[PDB]
PDB file of C-alpha atoms and ligand atoms in Angstrom:
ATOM      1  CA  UNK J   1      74.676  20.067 -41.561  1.00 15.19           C
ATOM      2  CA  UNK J   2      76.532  20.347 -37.857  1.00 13.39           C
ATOM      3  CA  UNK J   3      74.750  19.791 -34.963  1.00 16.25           C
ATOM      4  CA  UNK J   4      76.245  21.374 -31.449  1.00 15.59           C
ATOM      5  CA  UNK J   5      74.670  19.588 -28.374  1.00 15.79           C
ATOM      6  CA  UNK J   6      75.747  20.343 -25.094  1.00 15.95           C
ATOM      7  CA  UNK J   7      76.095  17.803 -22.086  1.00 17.28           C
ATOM      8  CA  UNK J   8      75.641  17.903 -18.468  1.00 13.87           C
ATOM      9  CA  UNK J   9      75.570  15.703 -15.710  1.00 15.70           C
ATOM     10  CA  UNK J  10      72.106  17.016 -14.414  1.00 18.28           C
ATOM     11  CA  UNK J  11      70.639  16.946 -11.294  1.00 19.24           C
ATOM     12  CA  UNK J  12      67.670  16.770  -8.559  1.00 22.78           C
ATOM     13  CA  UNK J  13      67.860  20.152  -8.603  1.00 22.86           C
ATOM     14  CA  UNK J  14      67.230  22.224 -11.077  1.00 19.63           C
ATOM     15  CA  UNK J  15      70.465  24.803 -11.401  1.00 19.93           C
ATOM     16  CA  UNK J  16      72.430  22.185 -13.625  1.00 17.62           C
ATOM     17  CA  UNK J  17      69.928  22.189 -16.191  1.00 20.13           C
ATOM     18  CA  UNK J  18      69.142  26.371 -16.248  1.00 18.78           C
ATOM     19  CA  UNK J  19      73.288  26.584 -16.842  1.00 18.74           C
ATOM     20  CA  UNK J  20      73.160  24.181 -19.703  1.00 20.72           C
ATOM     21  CA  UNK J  21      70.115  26.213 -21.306  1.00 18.50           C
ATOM     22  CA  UNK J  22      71.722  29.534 -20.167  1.00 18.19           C
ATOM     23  CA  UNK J  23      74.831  28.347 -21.968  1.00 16.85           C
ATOM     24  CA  UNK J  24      72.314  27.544 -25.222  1.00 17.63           C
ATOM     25  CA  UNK J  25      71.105  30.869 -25.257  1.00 19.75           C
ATOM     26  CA  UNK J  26      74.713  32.440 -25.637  1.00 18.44           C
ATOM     27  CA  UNK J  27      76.052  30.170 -28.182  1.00 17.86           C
ATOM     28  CA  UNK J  28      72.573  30.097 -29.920  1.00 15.78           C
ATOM     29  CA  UNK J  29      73.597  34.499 -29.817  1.00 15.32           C
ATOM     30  CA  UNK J  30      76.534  34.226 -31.449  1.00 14.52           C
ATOM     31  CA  UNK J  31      74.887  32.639 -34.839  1.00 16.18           C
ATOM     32  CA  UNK J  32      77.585  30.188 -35.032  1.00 16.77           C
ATOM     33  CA  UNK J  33      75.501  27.361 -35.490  1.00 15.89           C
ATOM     34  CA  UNK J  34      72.812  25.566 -37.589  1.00 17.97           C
ATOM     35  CA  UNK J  35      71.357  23.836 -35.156  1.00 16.08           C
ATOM     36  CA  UNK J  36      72.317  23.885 -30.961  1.00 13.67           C
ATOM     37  CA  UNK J  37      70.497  21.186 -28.135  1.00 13.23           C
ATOM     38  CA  UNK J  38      71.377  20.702 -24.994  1.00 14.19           C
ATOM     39  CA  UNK J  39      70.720  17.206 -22.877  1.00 13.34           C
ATOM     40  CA  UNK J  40      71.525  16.115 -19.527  1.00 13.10           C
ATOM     41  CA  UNK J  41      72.470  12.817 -18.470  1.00 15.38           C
ATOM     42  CA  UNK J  42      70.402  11.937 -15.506  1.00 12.29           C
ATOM     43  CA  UNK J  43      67.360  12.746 -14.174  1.00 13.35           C
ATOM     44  CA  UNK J  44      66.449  15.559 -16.173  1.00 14.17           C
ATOM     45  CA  UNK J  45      64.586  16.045 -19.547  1.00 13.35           C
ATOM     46  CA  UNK J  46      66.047  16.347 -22.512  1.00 12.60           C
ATOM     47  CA  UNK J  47      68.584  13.468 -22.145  1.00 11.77           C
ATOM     48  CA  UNK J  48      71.792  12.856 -24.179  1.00  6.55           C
ATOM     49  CA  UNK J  49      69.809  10.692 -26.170  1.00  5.19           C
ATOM     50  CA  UNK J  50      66.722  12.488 -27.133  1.00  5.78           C
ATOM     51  CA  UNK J  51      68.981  16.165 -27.741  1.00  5.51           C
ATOM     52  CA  UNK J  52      70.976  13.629 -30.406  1.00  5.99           C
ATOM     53  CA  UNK J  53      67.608  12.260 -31.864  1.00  9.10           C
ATOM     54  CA  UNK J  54      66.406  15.772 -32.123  1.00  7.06           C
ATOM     55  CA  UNK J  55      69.364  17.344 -33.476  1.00  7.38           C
ATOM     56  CA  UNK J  56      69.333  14.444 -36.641  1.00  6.35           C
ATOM     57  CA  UNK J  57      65.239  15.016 -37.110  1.00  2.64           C
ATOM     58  CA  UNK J  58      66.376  19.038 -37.909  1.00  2.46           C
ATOM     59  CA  UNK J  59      69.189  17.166 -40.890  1.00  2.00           C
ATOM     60  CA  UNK J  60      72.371  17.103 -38.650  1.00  2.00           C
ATOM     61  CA  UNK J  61      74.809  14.588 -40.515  1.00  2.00           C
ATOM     62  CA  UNK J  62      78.037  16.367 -38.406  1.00  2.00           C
ATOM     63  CA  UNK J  63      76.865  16.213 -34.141  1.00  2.00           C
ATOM     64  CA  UNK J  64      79.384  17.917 -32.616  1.00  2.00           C
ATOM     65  CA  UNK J  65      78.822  16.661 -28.688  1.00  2.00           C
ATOM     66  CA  UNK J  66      80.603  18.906 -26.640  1.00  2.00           C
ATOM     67  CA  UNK J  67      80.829  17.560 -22.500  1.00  3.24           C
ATOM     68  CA  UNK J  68      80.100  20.982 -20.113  1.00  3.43           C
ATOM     69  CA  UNK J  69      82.012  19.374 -16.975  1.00  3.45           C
ATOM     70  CA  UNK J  70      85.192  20.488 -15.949  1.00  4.81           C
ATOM     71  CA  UNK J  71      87.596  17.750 -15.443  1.00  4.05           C
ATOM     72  CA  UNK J  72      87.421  13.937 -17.142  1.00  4.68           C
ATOM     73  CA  UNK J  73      85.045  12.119 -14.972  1.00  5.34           C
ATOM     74  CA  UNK J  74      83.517   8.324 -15.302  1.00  5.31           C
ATOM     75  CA  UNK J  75      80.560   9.926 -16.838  1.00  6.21           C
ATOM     76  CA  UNK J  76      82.846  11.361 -19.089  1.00  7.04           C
ATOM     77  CA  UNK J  77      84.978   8.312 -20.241  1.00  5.88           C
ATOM     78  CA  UNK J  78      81.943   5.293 -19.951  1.00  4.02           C
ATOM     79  CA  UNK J  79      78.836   6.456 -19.500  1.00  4.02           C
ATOM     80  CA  UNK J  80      78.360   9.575 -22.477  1.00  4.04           C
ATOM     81  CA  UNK J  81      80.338   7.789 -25.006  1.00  2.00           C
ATOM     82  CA  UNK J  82      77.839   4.798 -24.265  1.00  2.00           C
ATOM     83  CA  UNK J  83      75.184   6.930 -25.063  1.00  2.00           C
ATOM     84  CA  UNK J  84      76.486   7.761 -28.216  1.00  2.00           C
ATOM     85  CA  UNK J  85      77.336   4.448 -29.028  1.00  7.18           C
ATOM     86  CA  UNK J  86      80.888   5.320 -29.355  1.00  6.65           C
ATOM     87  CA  UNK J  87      82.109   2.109 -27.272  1.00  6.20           C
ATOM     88  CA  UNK J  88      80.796  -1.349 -27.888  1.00  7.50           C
ATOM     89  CA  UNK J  89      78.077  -1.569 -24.531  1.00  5.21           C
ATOM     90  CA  UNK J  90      68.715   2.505 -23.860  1.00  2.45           C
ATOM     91  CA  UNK J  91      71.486   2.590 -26.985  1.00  2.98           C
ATOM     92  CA  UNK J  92      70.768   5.142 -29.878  1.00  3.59           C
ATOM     93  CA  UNK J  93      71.767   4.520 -33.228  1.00  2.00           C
ATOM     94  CA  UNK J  94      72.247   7.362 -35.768  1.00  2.00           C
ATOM     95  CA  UNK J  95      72.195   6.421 -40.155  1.00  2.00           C
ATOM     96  CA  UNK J  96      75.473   7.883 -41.223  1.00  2.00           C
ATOM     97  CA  UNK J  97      75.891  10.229 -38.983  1.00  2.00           C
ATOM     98  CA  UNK J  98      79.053  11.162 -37.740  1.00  2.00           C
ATOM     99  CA  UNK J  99      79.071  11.655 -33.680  1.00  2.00           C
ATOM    100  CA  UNK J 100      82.462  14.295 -32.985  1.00  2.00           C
ATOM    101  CA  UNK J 101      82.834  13.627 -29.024  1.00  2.00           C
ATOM    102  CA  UNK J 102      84.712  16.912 -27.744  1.00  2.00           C
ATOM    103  CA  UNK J 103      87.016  17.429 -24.991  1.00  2.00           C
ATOM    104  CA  UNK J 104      85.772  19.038 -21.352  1.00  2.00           C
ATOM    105  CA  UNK J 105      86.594  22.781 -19.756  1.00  2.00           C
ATOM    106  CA  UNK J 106      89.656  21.628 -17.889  1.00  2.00           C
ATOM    107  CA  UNK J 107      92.376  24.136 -16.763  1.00  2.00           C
ATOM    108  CA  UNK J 108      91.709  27.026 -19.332  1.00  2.00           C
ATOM    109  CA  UNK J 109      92.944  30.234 -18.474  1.00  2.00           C
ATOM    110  CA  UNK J 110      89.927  31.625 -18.634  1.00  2.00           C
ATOM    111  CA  UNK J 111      88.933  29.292 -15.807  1.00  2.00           C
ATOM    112  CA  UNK J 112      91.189  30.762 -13.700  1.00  2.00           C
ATOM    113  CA  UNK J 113      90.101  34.037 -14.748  1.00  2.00           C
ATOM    114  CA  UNK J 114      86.418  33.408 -13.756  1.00  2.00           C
ATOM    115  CA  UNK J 115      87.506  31.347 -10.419  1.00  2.00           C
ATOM    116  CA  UNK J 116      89.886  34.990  -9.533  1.00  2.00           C
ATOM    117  CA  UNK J 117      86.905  36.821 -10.146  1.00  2.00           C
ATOM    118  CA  UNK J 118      84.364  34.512  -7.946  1.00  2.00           C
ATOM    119  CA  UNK J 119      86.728  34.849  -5.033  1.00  2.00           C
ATOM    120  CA  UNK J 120      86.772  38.867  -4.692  1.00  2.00           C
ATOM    121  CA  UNK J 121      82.698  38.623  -5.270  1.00  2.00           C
ATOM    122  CA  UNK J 122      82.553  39.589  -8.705  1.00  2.00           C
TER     123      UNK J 122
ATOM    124  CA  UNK V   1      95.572  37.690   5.783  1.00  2.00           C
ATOM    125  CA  UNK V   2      93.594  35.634   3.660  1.00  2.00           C
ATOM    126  CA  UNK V   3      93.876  32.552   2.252  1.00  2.00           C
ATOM    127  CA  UNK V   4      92.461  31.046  -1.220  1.00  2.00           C
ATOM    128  CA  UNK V   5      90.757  27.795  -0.616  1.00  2.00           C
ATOM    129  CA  UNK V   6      89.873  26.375  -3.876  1.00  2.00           C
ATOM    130  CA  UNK V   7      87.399  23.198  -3.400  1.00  2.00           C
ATOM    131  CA  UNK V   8      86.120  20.876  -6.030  1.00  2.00           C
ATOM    132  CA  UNK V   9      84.142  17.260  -6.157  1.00  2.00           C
ATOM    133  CA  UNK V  10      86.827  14.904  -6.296  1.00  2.00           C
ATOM    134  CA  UNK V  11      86.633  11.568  -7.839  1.00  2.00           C
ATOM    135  CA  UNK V  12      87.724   8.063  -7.478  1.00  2.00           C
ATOM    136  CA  UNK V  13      89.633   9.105 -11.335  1.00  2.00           C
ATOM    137  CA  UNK V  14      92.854  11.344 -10.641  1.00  2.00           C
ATOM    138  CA  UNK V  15      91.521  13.949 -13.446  1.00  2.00           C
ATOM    139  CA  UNK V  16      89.644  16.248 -10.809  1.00  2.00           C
ATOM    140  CA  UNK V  17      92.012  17.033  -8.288  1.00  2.00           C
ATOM    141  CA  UNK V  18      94.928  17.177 -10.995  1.00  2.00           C
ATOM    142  CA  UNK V  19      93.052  20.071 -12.314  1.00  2.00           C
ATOM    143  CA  UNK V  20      92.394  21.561  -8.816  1.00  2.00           C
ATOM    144  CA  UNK V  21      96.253  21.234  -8.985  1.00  2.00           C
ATOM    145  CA  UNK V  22      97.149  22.870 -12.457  1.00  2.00           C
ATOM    146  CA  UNK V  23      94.443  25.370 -11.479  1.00  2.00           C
ATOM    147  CA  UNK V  24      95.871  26.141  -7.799  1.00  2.00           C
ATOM    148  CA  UNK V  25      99.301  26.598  -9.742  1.00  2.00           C
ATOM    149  CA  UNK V  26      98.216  28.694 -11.889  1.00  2.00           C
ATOM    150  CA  UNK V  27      96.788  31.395  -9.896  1.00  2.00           C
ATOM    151  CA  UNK V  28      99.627  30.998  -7.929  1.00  2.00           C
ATOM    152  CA  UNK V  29     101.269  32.413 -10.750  1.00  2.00           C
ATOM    153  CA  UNK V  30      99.233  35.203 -11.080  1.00  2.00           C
ATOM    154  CA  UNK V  31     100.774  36.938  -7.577  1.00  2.00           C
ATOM    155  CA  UNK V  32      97.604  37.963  -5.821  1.00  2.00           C
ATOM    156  CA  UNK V  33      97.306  35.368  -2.930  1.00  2.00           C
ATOM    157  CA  UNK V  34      99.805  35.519  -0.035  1.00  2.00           C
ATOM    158  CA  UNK V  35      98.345  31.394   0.748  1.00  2.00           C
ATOM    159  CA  UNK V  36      96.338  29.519  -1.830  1.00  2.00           C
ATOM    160  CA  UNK V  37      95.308  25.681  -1.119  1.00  2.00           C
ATOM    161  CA  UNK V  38      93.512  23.048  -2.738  1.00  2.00           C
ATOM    162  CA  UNK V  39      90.807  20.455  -1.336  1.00  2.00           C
ATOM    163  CA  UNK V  40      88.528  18.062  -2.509  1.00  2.00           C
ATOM    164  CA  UNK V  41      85.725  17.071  -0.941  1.00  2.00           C
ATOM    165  CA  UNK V  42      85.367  13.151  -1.388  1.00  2.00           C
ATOM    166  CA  UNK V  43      87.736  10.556  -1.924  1.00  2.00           C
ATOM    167  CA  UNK V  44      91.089  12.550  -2.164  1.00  2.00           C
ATOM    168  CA  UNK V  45      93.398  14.190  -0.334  1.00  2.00           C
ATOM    169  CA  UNK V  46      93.807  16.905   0.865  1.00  2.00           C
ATOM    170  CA  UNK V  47      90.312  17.324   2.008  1.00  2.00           C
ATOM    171  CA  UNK V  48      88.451  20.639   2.373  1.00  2.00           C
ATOM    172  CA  UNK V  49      88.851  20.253   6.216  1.00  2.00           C
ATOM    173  CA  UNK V  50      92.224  19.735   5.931  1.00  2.00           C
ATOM    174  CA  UNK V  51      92.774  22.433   3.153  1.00  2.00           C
ATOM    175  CA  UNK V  52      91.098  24.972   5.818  1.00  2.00           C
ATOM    176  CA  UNK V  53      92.953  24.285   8.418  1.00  2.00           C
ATOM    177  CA  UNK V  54      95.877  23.989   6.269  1.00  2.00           C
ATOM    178  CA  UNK V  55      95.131  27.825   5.716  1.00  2.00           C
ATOM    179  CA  UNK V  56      95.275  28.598   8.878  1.00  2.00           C
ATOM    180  CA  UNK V  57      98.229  26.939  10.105  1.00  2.00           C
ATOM    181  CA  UNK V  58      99.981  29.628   7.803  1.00  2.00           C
ATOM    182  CA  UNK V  59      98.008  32.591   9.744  1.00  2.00           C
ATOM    183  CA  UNK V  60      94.986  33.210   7.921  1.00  2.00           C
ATOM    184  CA  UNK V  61      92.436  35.019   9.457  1.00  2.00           C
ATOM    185  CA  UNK V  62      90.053  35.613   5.926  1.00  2.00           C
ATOM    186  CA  UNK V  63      89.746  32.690   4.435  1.00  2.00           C
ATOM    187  CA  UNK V  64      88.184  32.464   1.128  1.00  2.00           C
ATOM    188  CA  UNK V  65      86.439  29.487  -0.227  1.00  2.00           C
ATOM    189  CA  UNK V  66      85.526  29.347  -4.206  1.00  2.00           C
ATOM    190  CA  UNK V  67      83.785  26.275  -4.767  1.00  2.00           C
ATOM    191  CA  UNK V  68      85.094  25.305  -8.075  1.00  2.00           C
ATOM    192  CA  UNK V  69      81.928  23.587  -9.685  1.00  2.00           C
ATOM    193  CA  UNK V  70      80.010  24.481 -12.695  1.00  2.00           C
ATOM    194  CA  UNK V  71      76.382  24.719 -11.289  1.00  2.00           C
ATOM    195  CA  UNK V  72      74.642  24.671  -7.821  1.00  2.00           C
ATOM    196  CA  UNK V  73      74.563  21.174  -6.859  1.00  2.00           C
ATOM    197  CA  UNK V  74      73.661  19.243  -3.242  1.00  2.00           C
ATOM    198  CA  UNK V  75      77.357  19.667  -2.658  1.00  2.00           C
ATOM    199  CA  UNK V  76      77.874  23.497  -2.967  1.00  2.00           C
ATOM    200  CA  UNK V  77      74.633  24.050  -0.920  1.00  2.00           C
ATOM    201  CA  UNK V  78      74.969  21.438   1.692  1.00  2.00           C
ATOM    202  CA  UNK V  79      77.571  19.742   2.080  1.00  2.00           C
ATOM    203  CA  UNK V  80      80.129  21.816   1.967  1.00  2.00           C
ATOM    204  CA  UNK V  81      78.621  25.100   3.940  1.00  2.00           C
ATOM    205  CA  UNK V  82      78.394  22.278   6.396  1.00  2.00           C
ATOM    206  CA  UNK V  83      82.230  21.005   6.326  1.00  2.00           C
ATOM    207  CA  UNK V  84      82.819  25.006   6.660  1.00  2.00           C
ATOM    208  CA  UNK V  85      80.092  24.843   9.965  1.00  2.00           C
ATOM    209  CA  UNK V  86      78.690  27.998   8.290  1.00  2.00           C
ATOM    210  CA  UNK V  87      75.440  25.440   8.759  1.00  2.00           C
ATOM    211  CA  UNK V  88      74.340  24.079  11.724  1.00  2.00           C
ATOM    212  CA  UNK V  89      74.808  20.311  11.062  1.00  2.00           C
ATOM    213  CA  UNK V  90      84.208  15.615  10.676  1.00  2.00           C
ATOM    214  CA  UNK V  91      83.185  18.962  11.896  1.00  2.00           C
ATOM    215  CA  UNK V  92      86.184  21.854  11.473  1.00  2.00           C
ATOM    216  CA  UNK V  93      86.146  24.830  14.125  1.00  2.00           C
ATOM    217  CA  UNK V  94      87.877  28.146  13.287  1.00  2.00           C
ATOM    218  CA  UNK V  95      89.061  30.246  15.888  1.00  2.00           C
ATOM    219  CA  UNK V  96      87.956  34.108  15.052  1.00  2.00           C
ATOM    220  CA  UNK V  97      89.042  33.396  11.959  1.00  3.98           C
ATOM    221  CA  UNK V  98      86.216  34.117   9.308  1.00  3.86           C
ATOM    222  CA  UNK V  99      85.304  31.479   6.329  1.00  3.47           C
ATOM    223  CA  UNK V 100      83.903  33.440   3.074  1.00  4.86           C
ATOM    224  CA  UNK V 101      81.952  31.108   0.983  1.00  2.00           C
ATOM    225  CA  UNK V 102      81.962  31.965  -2.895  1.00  2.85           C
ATOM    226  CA  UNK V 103      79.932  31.666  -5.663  1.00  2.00           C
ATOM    227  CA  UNK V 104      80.302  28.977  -8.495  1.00  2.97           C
ATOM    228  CA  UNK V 105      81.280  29.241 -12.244  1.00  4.06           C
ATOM    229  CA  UNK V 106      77.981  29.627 -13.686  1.00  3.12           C
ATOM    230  CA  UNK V 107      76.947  30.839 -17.232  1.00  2.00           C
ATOM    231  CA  UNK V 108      79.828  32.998 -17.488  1.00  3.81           C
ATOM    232  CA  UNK V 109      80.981  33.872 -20.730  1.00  5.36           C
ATOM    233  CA  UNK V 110      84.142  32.732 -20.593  1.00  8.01           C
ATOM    234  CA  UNK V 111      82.755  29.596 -20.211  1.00  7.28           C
ATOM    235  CA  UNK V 112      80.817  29.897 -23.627  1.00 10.23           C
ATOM    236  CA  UNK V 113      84.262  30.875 -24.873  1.00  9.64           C
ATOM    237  CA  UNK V 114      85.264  28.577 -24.128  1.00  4.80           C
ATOM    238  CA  UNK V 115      82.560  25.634 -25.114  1.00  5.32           C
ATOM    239  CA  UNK V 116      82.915  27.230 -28.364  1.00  7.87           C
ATOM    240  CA  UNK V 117      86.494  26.315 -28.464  1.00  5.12           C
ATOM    241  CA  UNK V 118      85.722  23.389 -27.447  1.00  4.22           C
ATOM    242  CA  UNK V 119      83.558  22.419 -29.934  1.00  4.97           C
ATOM    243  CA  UNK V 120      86.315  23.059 -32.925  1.00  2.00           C
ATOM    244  CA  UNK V 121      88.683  20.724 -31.579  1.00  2.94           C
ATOM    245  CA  UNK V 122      90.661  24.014 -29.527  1.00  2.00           C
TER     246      UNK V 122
HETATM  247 CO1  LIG I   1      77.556  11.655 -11.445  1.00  2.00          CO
HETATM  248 CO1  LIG I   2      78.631  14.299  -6.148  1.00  2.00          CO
END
């Protein structure tokens, strides 16, 4: 009845878009969800888009979009909630379906914790 | 000794280096850096250039970078290794100082943790 789909910029190379599915594969592990995508938003396959389109087709009325970038950037604040035809401006359009647009990492604790970690090598 | 040199995109938007900032400030608050400094590589200040040198100025002779990005993008694999000259290509020069060039976040987690969270409106 809830869709998560996670969102990343993408990129030319391919280590943005093995994160995003890494990250699928651990929340897809902790059975918390009915359904879980994943779409990137350029250059990469699936888009934003396509990961919504596929997340209604499995009976998602509830897509919870969740942003995997760190701090608020344009793609963030124009260009995703575009996409999701959340702001009047390749549009999808969802039948009564509710889109939830989710907040980014930002300074989490935990953040800090990893970034402590990833300076001593660990 | 050594000096914590935390780097991130930067972005024309104040969000990214305001969470460099909160970030910086909060593992300052942990105790377990005698010199921590923040730098963003494009449009903001300080720069990673300046954030290096910055870290020297106040007798560093480790200096470690942690390149505070989610995945391995052009940036973490060439542009900055070449602000740092640890690639032969604005150019910084230590002296017998060495730079130590961290990993990024990756699929930690912490991270899923935290995109859970995220996802519940947490
Ligand atoms: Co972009
Ligand atoms: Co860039």
């Amino acid at each position: 009845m809830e869709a998560l789909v996670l969102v990343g910029h993408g990129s030319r190379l391919p280590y943005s878009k093995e994160l995003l599915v890494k990250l699928a594969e651990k929340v897809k592990e902790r059975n918390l969800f009915p359904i879980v995508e994943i779409g990137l938003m350029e250059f990469s396959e699936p888009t934003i888009p396509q990961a919504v389109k596929k997340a209604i087709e499995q009976g998602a009325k509830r897509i919870i979009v969740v942003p995997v970038f760190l701090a608020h950037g344009i793609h963030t604040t124009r260009d995703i909630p575009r996409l999701l035809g959340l702001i009047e401006d390749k549009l999808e359009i969802p039948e009564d379906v509710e889109i939830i647009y989710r907040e980014p990492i930002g300074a989490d604790d935990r953040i800090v914790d990893i970034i402590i970690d990833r300076a001593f090598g660990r």
